[PDB]
Each structure stands twice: as C-alpha cells, then as structure tokens.
JSON list of C-alpha atoms in Angstrom, two decimals:
[
{"chain": "A", "resi": 500, "resn": "UNK", "atom": "CA", "xyz": [-0.07, -0.06, -0.01]},
{"chain": "A", "resi": 501, "resn": "UNK", "atom": "CA", "xyz": [0.86, 3.72, -0.85]},
{"chain": "A", "resi": 502, "resn": "UNK", "atom": "CA", "xyz": [0.62, 6.26, 1.78]},
{"chain": "A", "resi": 503, "resn": "UNK", "atom": "CA", "xyz": [2.03, 9.77, 1.55]},
{"chain": "A", "resi": 504, "resn": "UNK", "atom": "CA", "xyz": [2.32, 12.19, 4.27]},
{"chain": "A", "resi": 505, "resn": "UNK", "atom": "CA", "xyz": [1.21, 15.64, 3.70]},
{"chain": "A", "resi": 506, "resn": "UNK", "atom": "CA", "xyz": [4.99, 16.97, 3.51]},
{"chain": "A", "resi": 507, "resn": "UNK", "atom": "CA", "xyz": [5.81, 14.24, 0.98]},
{"chain": "A", "resi": 508, "resn": "UNK", "atom": "CA", "xyz": [3.01, 15.32, -1.31]},
{"chain": "A", "resi": 509, "resn": "UNK", "atom": "CA", "xyz": [4.09, 18.98, -1.18]},
{"chain": "A", "resi": 510, "resn": "UNK", "atom": "CA", "xyz": [7.87, 18.13, -1.82]},
{"chain": "A", "resi": 511, "resn": "UNK", "atom": "CA", "xyz": [6.66, 16.13, -4.90]},
{"chain": "A", "resi": 512, "resn": "UNK", "atom": "CA", "xyz": [5.07, 19.33, -6.31]},
{"chain": "A", "resi": 513, "resn": "UNK", "atom": "CA", "xyz": [8.56, 20.94, -6.93]},
{"chain": "B", "resi": 44, "resn": "UNK", "atom": "CA", "xyz": [21.94, -3.44, -14.57]},
{"chain": "B", "resi": 45, "resn": "UNK", "atom": "CA", "xyz": [18.92, -1.20, -15.22]},
{"chain": "B", "resi": 46, "resn": "UNK", "atom": "CA", "xyz": [18.41, 2.43, -14.22]},
{"chain": "B", "resi": 47, "resn": "UNK", "atom": "CA", "xyz": [17.30, 3.30, -10.54]},
{"chain": "B", "resi": 48, "resn": "UNK", "atom": "CA", "xyz": [13.57, 3.90, -10.56]},
{"chain": "B", "resi": 49, "resn": "UNK", "atom": "CA", "xyz": [13.89, 6.56, -7.90]},
{"chain": "B", "resi": 50, "resn": "UNK", "atom": "CA", "xyz": [15.44, 8.74, -10.42]},
{"chain": "B", "resi": 51, "resn": "UNK", "atom": "CA", "xyz": [12.78, 8.77, -13.15]},
{"chain": "B", "resi": 52, "resn": "UNK", "atom": "CA", "xyz": [9.34, 7.05, -12.17]},
{"chain": "B", "resi": 53, "resn": "UNK", "atom": "CA", "xyz": [6.31, 9.10, -11.19]},
{"chain": "B", "resi": 54, "resn": "UNK", "atom": "CA", "xyz": [5.16, 8.29, -7.63]},
{"chain": "B", "resi": 55, "resn": "UNK", "atom": "CA", "xyz": [2.04, 6.13, -7.80]},
{"chain": "B", "resi": 56, "resn": "UNK", "atom": "CA", "xyz": [-0.94, 6.61, -5.75]},
{"chain": "B", "resi": 57, "resn": "UNK", "atom": "CA", "xyz": [-2.72, 3.76, -4.09]},
{"chain": "B", "resi": 58, "resn": "UNK", "atom": "CA", "xyz": [-5.99, 4.64, -5.96]},
{"chain": "B", "resi": 59, "resn": "UNK", "atom": "CA", "xyz": [-6.86, 6.32, -9.38]},
{"chain": "B", "resi": 60, "resn": "UNK", "atom": "CA", "xyz": [-8.93, 9.48, -8.69]},
{"chain": "B", "resi": 61, "resn": "UNK", "atom": "CA", "xyz": [-11.28, 11.39, -10.85]},
{"chain": "B", "resi": 62, "resn": "UNK", "atom": "CA", "xyz": [-11.93, 15.12, -10.55]},
{"chain": "B", "resi": 63, "resn": "UNK", "atom": "CA", "xyz": [-15.53, 16.21, -11.51]},
{"chain": "B", "resi": 64, "resn": "UNK", "atom": "CA", "xyz": [-16.96, 19.60, -12.07]},
{"chain": "B", "resi": 65, "resn": "UNK", "atom": "CA", "xyz": [-20.62, 20.62, -11.42]},
{"chain": "B", "resi": 66, "resn": "UNK", "atom": "CA", "xyz": [-21.71, 23.65, -13.40]},
{"chain": "B", "resi": 67, "resn": "UNK", "atom": "CA", "xyz": [-24.57, 25.68, -12.03]},
{"chain": "B", "resi": 68, "resn": "UNK", "atom": "CA", "xyz": [-26.75, 26.00, -15.15]},
{"chain": "B", "resi": 69, "resn": "UNK", "atom": "CA", "xyz": [-30.44, 26.02, -14.16]},
{"chain": "B", "resi": 70, "resn": "UNK", "atom": "CA", "xyz": [-31.52, 25.64, -17.70]},
{"chain": "B", "resi": 71, "resn": "UNK", "atom": "CA", "xyz": [-29.97, 22.14, -17.79]},
{"chain": "B", "resi": 72, "resn": "UNK", "atom": "CA", "xyz": [-30.48, 18.94, -15.85]},
{"chain": "B", "resi": 73, "resn": "UNK", "atom": "CA", "xyz": [-28.36, 17.90, -12.91]},
{"chain": "B", "resi": 74, "resn": "UNK", "atom": "CA", "xyz": [-26.87, 15.01, -14.95]},
{"chain": "B", "resi": 75, "resn": "UNK", "atom": "CA", "xyz": [-25.91, 17.35, -17.88]},
{"chain": "B", "resi": 76, "resn": "UNK", "atom": "CA", "xyz": [-24.29, 19.77, -15.42]},
{"chain": "B", "resi": 77, "resn": "UNK", "atom": "CA", "xyz": [-22.04, 17.15, -13.89]},
{"chain": "B", "resi": 78, "resn": "UNK", "atom": "CA", "xyz": [-18.99, 16.27, -15.94]},
{"chain": "B", "resi": 79, "resn": "UNK", "atom": "CA", "xyz": [-15.58, 14.52, -15.44]},
{"chain": "B", "resi": 80, "resn": "UNK", "atom": "CA", "xyz": [-12.49, 16.73, -15.78]},
{"chain": "B", "resi": 81, "resn": "UNK", "atom": "CA", "xyz": [-9.95, 14.04, -15.76]},
{"chain": "B", "resi": 82, "resn": "UNK", "atom": "CA", "xyz": [-8.30, 11.18, -13.74]},
{"chain": "B", "resi": 83, "resn": "UNK", "atom": "CA", "xyz": [-4.90, 10.57, -12.37]},
{"chain": "B", "resi": 84, "resn": "UNK", "atom": "CA", "xyz": [-2.98, 8.12, -10.42]},
{"chain": "B", "resi": 85, "resn": "UNK", "atom": "CA", "xyz": [0.37, 9.64, -9.46]},
{"chain": "B", "resi": 86, "resn": "UNK", "atom": "CA", "xyz": [1.42, 12.46, -7.23]},
{"chain": "B", "resi": 87, "resn": "UNK", "atom": "CA", "xyz": [2.93, 14.24, -10.31]},
{"chain": "B", "resi": 88, "resn": "UNK", "atom": "CA", "xyz": [-0.30, 14.00, -12.31]},
{"chain": "B", "resi": 89, "resn": "UNK", "atom": "CA", "xyz": [-2.35, 15.22, -9.38]},
{"chain": "B", "resi": 90, "resn": "UNK", "atom": "CA", "xyz": [-0.27, 18.32, -9.32]},
{"chain": "B", "resi": 91, "resn": "UNK", "atom": "CA", "xyz": [-0.52, 18.88, -13.04]},
{"chain": "B", "resi": 92, "resn": "UNK", "atom": "CA", "xyz": [-4.24, 18.83, -12.65]},
{"chain": "B", "resi": 93, "resn": "UNK", "atom": "CA", "xyz": [-4.47, 21.05, -9.52]},
{"chain": "B", "resi": 94, "resn": "UNK", "atom": "CA", "xyz": [-1.75, 23.55, -10.72]},
{"chain": "B", "resi": 95, "resn": "UNK", "atom": "CA", "xyz": [-4.00, 24.49, -13.85]},
{"chain": "B", "resi": 96, "resn": "UNK", "atom": "CA", "xyz": [-7.38, 24.77, -12.38]},
{"chain": "B", "resi": 97, "resn": "UNK", "atom": "CA", "xyz": [-9.28, 27.49, -10.51]},
{"chain": "B", "resi": 98, "resn": "UNK", "atom": "CA", "xyz": [-9.21, 27.71, -6.82]},
{"chain": "B", "resi": 99, "resn": "UNK", "atom": "CA", "xyz": [-12.56, 26.83, -5.29]},
{"chain": "B", "resi": 100, "resn": "UNK", "atom": "CA", "xyz": [-12.85, 30.42, -3.98]},
{"chain": "B", "resi": 101, "resn": "UNK", "atom": "CA", "xyz": [-12.88, 31.69, -7.70]},
{"chain": "B", "resi": 102, "resn": "UNK", "atom": "CA", "xyz": [-15.68, 29.37, -8.96]},
{"chain": "B", "resi": 103, "resn": "UNK", "atom": "CA", "xyz": [-19.04, 30.88, -9.77]},
{"chain": "B", "resi": 104, "resn": "UNK", "atom": "CA", "xyz": [-21.76, 30.47, -7.23]},
{"chain": "B", "resi": 105, "resn": "UNK", "atom": "CA", "xyz": [-23.51, 26.96, -7.19]},
{"chain": "B", "resi": 106, "resn": "UNK", "atom": "CA", "xyz": [-20.54, 25.05, -8.71]},
{"chain": "B", "resi": 107, "resn": "UNK", "atom": "CA", "xyz": [-18.81, 22.19, -7.14]},
{"chain": "B", "resi": 108, "resn": "UNK", "atom": "CA", "xyz": [-15.57, 20.22, -7.41]},
{"chain": "B", "resi": 109, "resn": "UNK", "atom": "CA", "xyz": [-15.63, 16.61, -6.45]},
{"chain": "B", "resi": 110, "resn": "UNK", "atom": "CA", "xyz": [-12.74, 14.06, -6.08]},
{"chain": "B", "resi": 111, "resn": "UNK", "atom": "CA", "xyz": [-13.88, 10.44, -6.07]},
{"chain": "B", "resi": 112, "resn": "UNK", "atom": "CA", "xyz": [-12.09, 7.17, -6.47]},
{"chain": "B", "resi": 113, "resn": "UNK", "atom": "CA", "xyz": [-12.28, 5.93, -10.02]},
{"chain": "B", "resi": 114, "resn": "UNK", "atom": "CA", "xyz": [-15.55, 4.27, -10.61]},
{"chain": "B", "resi": 115, "resn": "UNK", "atom": "CA", "xyz": [-17.46, 5.99, -7.96]},
{"chain": "B", "resi": 116, "resn": "UNK", "atom": "CA", "xyz": [-19.76, 8.75, -9.29]},
{"chain": "B", "resi": 117, "resn": "UNK", "atom": "CA", "xyz": [-20.11, 11.80, -6.99]},
{"chain": "B", "resi": 118, "resn": "UNK", "atom": "CA", "xyz": [-23.86, 11.17, -6.25]},
{"chain": "B", "resi": 119, "resn": "UNK", "atom": "CA", "xyz": [-25.40, 9.54, -3.29]},
{"chain": "B", "resi": 120, "resn": "UNK", "atom": "CA", "xyz": [-27.12, 7.07, -5.46]},
{"chain": "B", "resi": 121, "resn": "UNK", "atom": "CA", "xyz": [-24.08, 5.37, -6.50]},
{"chain": "B", "resi": 122, "resn": "UNK", "atom": "CA", "xyz": [-23.58, 1.79, -5.16]},
{"chain": "B", "resi": 123, "resn": "UNK", "atom": "CA", "xyz": [-20.67, 2.89, -3.05]},
{"chain": "B", "resi": 124, "resn": "UNK", "atom": "CA", "xyz": [-22.41, 5.94, -1.56]},
{"chain": "B", "resi": 125, "resn": "UNK", "atom": "CA", "xyz": [-26.03, 5.04, -1.06]},
{"chain": "B", "resi": 126, "resn": "UNK", "atom": "CA", "xyz": [-25.56, 3.42, 2.39]},
{"chain": "B", "resi": 127, "resn": "UNK", "atom": "CA", "xyz": [-22.91, 6.01, 3.17]},
{"chain": "B", "resi": 128, "resn": "UNK", "atom": "CA", "xyz": [-22.48, 9.52, 4.60]},
{"chain": "B", "resi": 129, "resn": "UNK", "atom": "CA", "xyz": [-20.31, 12.54, 4.83]},
{"chain": "B", "resi": 130, "resn": "UNK", "atom": "CA", "xyz": [-18.08, 14.43, 7.48]},
{"chain": "B", "resi": 131, "resn": "UNK", "atom": "CA", "xyz": [-19.44, 18.05, 6.84]},
{"chain": "B", "resi": 132, "resn": "UNK", "atom": "CA", "xyz": [-17.43, 21.23, 7.22]},
{"chain": "B", "resi": 133, "resn": "UNK", "atom": "CA", "xyz": [-19.64, 24.29, 6.90]},
{"chain": "B", "resi": 134, "resn": "UNK", "atom": "CA", "xyz": [-17.92, 27.68, 6.05]},
{"chain": "B", "resi": 135, "resn": "UNK", "atom": "CA", "xyz": [-19.47, 31.08, 6.71]},
{"chain": "B", "resi": 136, "resn": "UNK", "atom": "CA", "xyz": [-19.01, 33.89, 4.23]},
{"chain": "B", "resi": 137, "resn": "UNK", "atom": "CA", "xyz": [-15.83, 35.08, 5.87]},
{"chain": "B", "resi": 138, "resn": "UNK", "atom": "CA", "xyz": [-14.16, 31.64, 5.85]},
{"chain": "B", "resi": 139, "resn": "UNK", "atom": "CA", "xyz": [-14.49, 31.74, 1.90]},
{"chain": "B", "resi": 140, "resn": "UNK", "atom": "CA", "xyz": [-11.48, 34.11, 2.19]},
{"chain": "B", "resi": 141, "resn": "UNK", "atom": "CA", "xyz": [-9.52, 32.60, 5.07]},
{"chain": "B", "resi": 142, "resn": "UNK", "atom": "CA", "xyz": [-10.01, 28.80, 4.91]},
{"chain": "B", "resi": 143, "resn": "UNK", "atom": "CA", "xyz": [-11.92, 27.42, 1.79]},
{"chain": "B", "resi": 144, "resn": "UNK", "atom": "CA", "xyz": [-9.01, 26.80, -0.48]},
{"chain": "B", "resi": 145, "resn": "UNK", "atom": "CA", "xyz": [-6.63, 25.78, 2.31]},
{"chain": "B", "resi": 146, "resn": "UNK", "atom": "CA", "xyz": [-9.30, 23.27, 3.57]},
{"chain": "B", "resi": 147, "resn": "UNK", "atom": "CA", "xyz": [-10.07, 21.91, 0.12]},
{"chain": "B", "resi": 148, "resn": "UNK", "atom": "CA", "xyz": [-6.34, 21.33, -0.77]},
{"chain": "B", "resi": 149, "resn": "UNK", "atom": "CA", "xyz": [-5.80, 19.70, 2.75]},
{"chain": "B", "resi": 150, "resn": "UNK", "atom": "CA", "xyz": [-8.87, 17.47, 1.83]},
{"chain": "B", "resi": 151, "resn": "UNK", "atom": "CA", "xyz": [-7.33, 16.37, -1.49]},
{"chain": "B", "resi": 152, "resn": "UNK", "atom": "CA", "xyz": [-4.13, 15.60, -0.07]},
{"chain": "B", "resi": 153, "resn": "UNK", "atom": "CA", "xyz": [-5.79, 13.47, 2.89]},
{"chain": "B", "resi": 154, "resn": "UNK", "atom": "CA", "xyz": [-7.52, 11.51, 0.02]},
{"chain": "B", "resi": 155, "resn": "UNK", "atom": "CA", "xyz": [-4.80, 10.93, -2.37]},
{"chain": "B", "resi": 156, "resn": "UNK", "atom": "CA", "xyz": [-2.32, 10.26, 0.46]},
{"chain": "B", "resi": 157, "resn": "UNK", "atom": "CA", "xyz": [-4.44, 7.47, 2.00]},
{"chain": "B", "resi": 158, "resn": "UNK", "atom": "CA", "xyz": [-4.35, 9.41, 5.28]},
{"chain": "B", "resi": 159, "resn": "UNK", "atom": "CA", "xyz": [-6.96, 7.31, 7.16]},
{"chain": "B", "resi": 160, "resn": "UNK", "atom": "CA", "xyz": [-4.71, 4.57, 8.15]},
{"chain": "B", "resi": 161, "resn": "UNK", "atom": "CA", "xyz": [-6.67, 1.18, 8.25]},
{"chain": "B", "resi": 162, "resn": "UNK", "atom": "CA", "xyz": [-9.90, 2.86, 7.28]},
{"chain": "B", "resi": 163, "resn": "UNK", "atom": "CA", "xyz": [-8.81, 4.34, 3.88]},
{"chain": "B", "resi": 164, "resn": "UNK", "atom": "CA", "xyz": [-10.99, 1.94, 2.07]},
{"chain": "B", "resi": 165, "resn": "UNK", "atom": "CA", "xyz": [-14.17, 3.41, 3.58]},
{"chain": "B", "resi": 166, "resn": "UNK", "atom": "CA", "xyz": [-13.45, 6.82, 1.80]},
{"chain": "B", "resi": 167, "resn": "UNK", "atom": "CA", "xyz": [-15.33, 7.34, -1.45]},
{"chain": "B", "resi": 168, "resn": "UNK", "atom": "CA", "xyz": [-14.37, 11.02, -2.05]},
{"chain": "B", "resi": 169, "resn": "UNK", "atom": "CA", "xyz": [-14.90, 14.57, -1.36]},
{"chain": "B", "resi": 170, "resn": "UNK", "atom": "CA", "xyz": [-17.00, 17.34, -2.57]},
{"chain": "B", "resi": 171, "resn": "UNK", "atom": "CA", "xyz": [-16.55, 21.19, -2.24]},
{"chain": "B", "resi": 172, "resn": "UNK", "atom": "CA", "xyz": [-19.85, 23.25, -2.69]},
{"chain": "B", "resi": 173, "resn": "UNK", "atom": "CA", "xyz": [-19.12, 26.88, -3.61]},
{"chain": "B", "resi": 174, "resn": "UNK", "atom": "CA", "xyz": [-22.33, 28.60, -2.31]},
{"chain": "B", "resi": 175, "resn": "UNK", "atom": "CA", "xyz": [-23.53, 32.21, -1.63]},
{"chain": "B", "resi": 176, "resn": "UNK", "atom": "CA", "xyz": [-25.34, 30.99, 1.41]},
{"chain": "B", "resi": 177, "resn": "UNK", "atom": "CA", "xyz": [-22.20, 29.40, 2.75]},
{"chain": "B", "resi": 178, "resn": "UNK", "atom": "CA", "xyz": [-19.69, 26.98, 1.40]},
{"chain": "B", "resi": 179, "resn": "UNK", "atom": "CA", "xyz": [-19.30, 23.29, 2.30]},
{"chain": "B", "resi": 180, "resn": "UNK", "atom": "CA", "xyz": [-16.63, 20.74, 2.14]},
{"chain": "B", "resi": 181, "resn": "UNK", "atom": "CA", "xyz": [-17.28, 17.07, 2.93]},
{"chain": "B", "resi": 182, "resn": "UNK", "atom": "CA", "xyz": [-15.64, 13.66, 2.95]},
{"chain": "B", "resi": 183, "resn": "UNK", "atom": "CA", "xyz": [-17.95, 10.96, 1.64]},
{"chain": "B", "resi": 184, "resn": "UNK", "atom": "CA", "xyz": [-17.54, 7.47, 3.25]},
{"chain": "B", "resi": 185, "resn": "UNK", "atom": "CA", "xyz": [-19.19, 4.11, 2.06]},
{"chain": "B", "resi": 186, "resn": "UNK", "atom": "CA", "xyz": [-21.13, 2.97, 5.14]},
{"chain": "B", "resi": 187, "resn": "UNK", "atom": "CA", "xyz": [-22.70, 5.06, 7.89]},
{"chain": "B", "resi": 188, "resn": "UNK", "atom": "CA", "xyz": [-23.01, 2.14, 10.25]},
{"chain": "B", "resi": 189, "resn": "UNK", "atom": "CA", "xyz": [-19.20, 1.48, 10.23]},
{"chain": "B", "resi": 190, "resn": "UNK", "atom": "CA", "xyz": [-19.00, 3.29, 13.50]},
{"chain": "B", "resi": 191, "resn": "UNK", "atom": "CA", "xyz": [-15.13, 2.63, 14.08]},
{"chain": "B", "resi": 192, "resn": "UNK", "atom": "CA", "xyz": [-14.21, 3.82, 10.58]},
{"chain": "B", "resi": 193, "resn": "UNK", "atom": "CA", "xyz": [-16.46, 6.76, 10.39]},
{"chain": "B", "resi": 194, "resn": "UNK", "atom": "CA", "xyz": [-15.27, 8.05, 13.75]},
{"chain": "B", "resi": 195, "resn": "UNK", "atom": "CA", "xyz": [-11.55, 7.46, 12.89]},
{"chain": "B", "resi": 196, "resn": "UNK", "atom": "CA", "xyz": [-11.79, 9.24, 9.51]},
{"chain": "B", "resi": 197, "resn": "UNK", "atom": "CA", "xyz": [-13.43, 12.28, 11.39]},
{"chain": "B", "resi": 198, "resn": "UNK", "atom": "CA", "xyz": [-10.83, 12.65, 13.95]},
{"chain": "B", "resi": 199, "resn": "UNK", "atom": "CA", "xyz": [-8.00, 12.18, 11.18]},
{"chain": "B", "resi": 200, "resn": "UNK", "atom": "CA", "xyz": [-9.83, 14.91, 9.07]},
{"chain": "B", "resi": 201, "resn": "UNK", "atom": "CA", "xyz": [-10.43, 17.32, 11.93]},
{"chain": "B", "resi": 202, "resn": "UNK", "atom": "CA", "xyz": [-6.87, 17.11, 12.97]},
{"chain": "B", "resi": 203, "resn": "UNK", "atom": "CA", "xyz": [-5.47, 17.38, 9.35]},
{"chain": "B", "resi": 204, "resn": "UNK", "atom": "CA", "xyz": [-7.69, 20.56, 8.99]},
{"chain": "B", "resi": 205, "resn": "UNK", "atom": "CA", "xyz": [-6.26, 21.93, 12.13]},
{"chain": "B", "resi": 206, "resn": "UNK", "atom": "CA", "xyz": [-9.59, 22.63, 13.89]},
{"chain": "B", "resi": 207, "resn": "UNK", "atom": "CA", "xyz": [-9.48, 23.16, 17.67]},
{"chain": "B", "resi": 208, "resn": "UNK", "atom": "CA", "xyz": [-11.21, 20.89, 20.21]},
{"chain": "B", "resi": 209, "resn": "UNK", "atom": "CA", "xyz": [-13.69, 23.72, 20.75]},
{"chain": "B", "resi": 210, "resn": "UNK", "atom": "CA", "xyz": [-15.01, 23.36, 17.04]},
{"chain": "B", "resi": 211, "resn": "UNK", "atom": "CA", "xyz": [-17.42, 20.53, 16.44]},
{"chain": "B", "resi": 212, "resn": "UNK", "atom": "CA", "xyz": [-17.97, 18.74, 13.16]},
{"chain": "B", "resi": 213, "resn": "UNK", "atom": "CA", "xyz": [-20.82, 16.33, 12.30]},
{"chain": "B", "resi": 214, "resn": "UNK", "atom": "CA", "xyz": [-21.24, 13.17, 10.17]},
{"chain": "B", "resi": 215, "resn": "UNK", "atom": "CA", "xyz": [-24.54, 12.74, 8.44]},
{"chain": "B", "resi": 216, "resn": "UNK", "atom": "CA", "xyz": [-25.76, 9.64, 6.40]},
{"chain": "B", "resi": 217, "resn": "UNK", "atom": "CA", "xyz": [-26.84, 10.54, 2.88]},
{"chain": "B", "resi": 218, "resn": "UNK", "atom": "CA", "xyz": [-30.37, 8.87, 3.54]},
{"chain": "B", "resi": 219, "resn": "UNK", "atom": "CA", "xyz": [-30.97, 11.21, 6.60]},
{"chain": "B", "resi": 220, "resn": "UNK", "atom": "CA", "xyz": [-29.89, 14.40, 4.61]},
{"chain": "B", "resi": 221, "resn": "UNK", "atom": "CA", "xyz": [-32.21, 13.22, 1.80]},
{"chain": "B", "resi": 222, "resn": "UNK", "atom": "CA", "xyz": [-35.18, 12.63, 4.06]},
{"chain": "B", "resi": 223, "resn": "UNK", "atom": "CA", "xyz": [-34.54, 15.59, 6.50]},
{"chain": "B", "resi": 224, "resn": "UNK", "atom": "CA", "xyz": [-37.40, 17.71, 7.81]},
{"chain": "B", "resi": 225, "resn": "UNK", "atom": "CA", "xyz": [-36.25, 21.43, 7.73]},
{"chain": "B", "resi": 226, "resn": "UNK", "atom": "CA", "xyz": [-32.93, 23.07, 7.28]},
{"chain": "B", "resi": 227, "resn": "UNK", "atom": "CA", "xyz": [-30.72, 20.88, 9.59]},
{"chain": "B", "resi": 228, "resn": "UNK", "atom": "CA", "xyz": [-29.87, 17.09, 9.32]},
{"chain": "B", "resi": 229, "resn": "UNK", "atom": "CA", "xyz": [-29.31, 15.04, 12.54]},
{"chain": "B", "resi": 230, "resn": "UNK", "atom": "CA", "xyz": [-25.72, 14.01, 13.19]},
{"chain": "B", "resi": 231, "resn": "UNK", "atom": "CA", "xyz": [-25.01, 10.20, 13.47]},
{"chain": "B", "resi": 232, "resn": "UNK", "atom": "CA", "xyz": [-21.35, 11.10, 14.92]},
{"chain": "B", "resi": 233, "resn": "UNK", "atom": "CA", "xyz": [-19.64, 14.23, 16.05]},
{"chain": "B", "resi": 234, "resn": "UNK", "atom": "CA", "xyz": [-15.84, 14.92, 16.65]}
]
C-alpha cells in the first residue's frame, strides 16, 4: 500500500 | 543493470482518482451539469491537474468540485455511496477568504495520500460546494454504520484541517440528509 504524508505530497510538487 | 527507478518514475497513488465539475446552469439537468474533468493516479499527475485549475474560492456560485475514487460517481445514488454519509465542514461567508482553498487542498491531500490508516478503503471521495449561502466541504464514506471507521476518519480529518477541540464537526448519512425535515440534518457522529 501507498501512503504519503502531507509533507511528501508537497515536496513532490517541486 | 537497469536504471534506478527513484531517478525517473512518477510516484504512484494507491488509487486512481477522478476530478469532477458541477456547473450551475438552471436551464440544464443535474446530469448534464455534472462532468468529469480528468483522472490521475500519481502524485505528479495530481499536481499537473491542481496547478492548472481555478481555486474553489474563484468558482461561480452554485458550482462544485468533487474528487472520487475511479468508478464512484459523486452522487449519493452510486452503489458505493447509497449506504454512506459525509463528514461536513460548513464555512461562513468570511471563511471563503481565510479557509476554503486551504481546507479543500488539505482534503485532496488526505484523500490521495491515504491518510486514514486502516480505514482508507471506507473513503469514497470529497466534494466542495461553492455557495452564496455558505460553502461546504465534505468527505464521503461508504457505510454510515461502520462506527469505528467513520469516527476514525472524522478525527483524522479534523486534525488534518487543524480545527481546535472547541470546534465540533458532524457526520450525516446521505439517507438522513435526503429525508430531512427542515434546514438541519441530525448527526450520526460528531468529533
């Protein structure tokens, strides 16, 4: 299963 | 040897999601006013979508965004919604400015990130209703009698939104909302 933290999601925007 | 996937793969989501738009046009039916925008299943594809679309606070009165798991339509009559319900966030006219867009992005991130631990499978989607009378954001879950799941989802969502203990939010089954006498629907749960 794939879980992303909020932080991780924002970082992957860059 | 092959290339290291870390260097070039998009980061997959657990689910494929679909973003929908409801256009307020009283000359057309509800069905004709609800359309798919597009679907995505990676973090990078989510941002490509989010980055190019209007913020909820800039939509015309009466319009909605909805983000639902692929194959669930954003209507309570869908098989996965009919026995379900929603955690409802009501915003006053001042919160349009201070909270609507932050709360909606937080909501999207909760969904795509699978932020509900062991209860992520109960989540169907979320809706933001942009309304002159007051905006609403809701997370929709699949079964209103899954007390453990619904309560867990609520606490997670409340804390992700950063609402203080003083603030109380409610969960309402879609059936109860549909059959409500008067303006207010009774809460099956509160957190």
